[PDB]
Amino acid sequence: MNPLAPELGEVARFAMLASQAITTTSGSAIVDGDLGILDQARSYYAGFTPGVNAGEFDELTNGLSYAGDDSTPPYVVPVPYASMVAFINQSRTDLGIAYNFLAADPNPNAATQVCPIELGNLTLTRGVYKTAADVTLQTGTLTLDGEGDPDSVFIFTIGGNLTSGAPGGDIVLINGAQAKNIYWRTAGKTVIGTNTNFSGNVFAWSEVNVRTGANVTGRLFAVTDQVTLDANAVTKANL
Ligand SMILES: [Cl-]
Ligand SMILES: [Cl-]
């Protein structure tokens, strides 16, 4: 059966969310999602350009950035929260819930399959793919095949790191597969290779490092450390 996707709660609003820091080199463009740092002040944003209105970054369209030290005035507390601290509190809790959902075996509605340690040149159907080792996506393209059902859910749950890179590293979606229904969970870090096309919601326990020029469609979560960008186009997957 189709795997049950995690509940994201408040953190569905974020394109990127980290405990410690979100950083970028120049040349990044983030769209359709918010940015958040949960456990450090706004000073832990690096590389971004504050825009006209409080919370805006020039690099960020249809979204705002958030940190718990954001005062009102001039920042704006998201509805319906009474304070920015309360908004960060619910976001922190809901991130933990969703990471834990993806880390727990088995999924409530689907049996676990083996995740290959190299995902290049494979075509995979929906399901839950688990391994305790590290996973690489580099020999070629990973094609995710929704078998004609736009609701098909893909969960990759990984006890080590996840790294895409050269010579391949791209993710292609066919037959109904959608970025919003793909989930990547690493107990280690997630590293996305230079100039690749990546799809899915990344829940890295430690950090997410997106390398030069990669294109992300999905979400980037670092539960305990940081999300770093290097000239990336990041688009939040539609709700
Ligand atoms: Cl684990
Ligand atoms: Cl999508």
From Swiss-Prot:
A motif (Ice-binding site motif (T-A/G-X-T/N)) lies at residues 212-215. The record marks T212 as: Ice-binding. It comes from the Bacteria. It is found in: Cell outer membrane. Ice-binding adhesion protein that adsorbs this bacterium onto ice to maintain a favorable position in its aquatic habitat. Inhibits growth of the ice crystals. Has high thermal hysteresis (TH) activity, which is the ability to lower the freezing point of an aqueous solution below its melting point. The TH activity of this protein is approximately 1.4 degrees Celsius at 25 uM and little below 2 degrees Celsius at 80 uM. Belongs to the ice-binding protein family. This is Ice-binding protein 1. It comes from Shewanella frigidimarina (strain NCIMB 400). The chain holds residues 656 to 892 of 892 of the full protein.
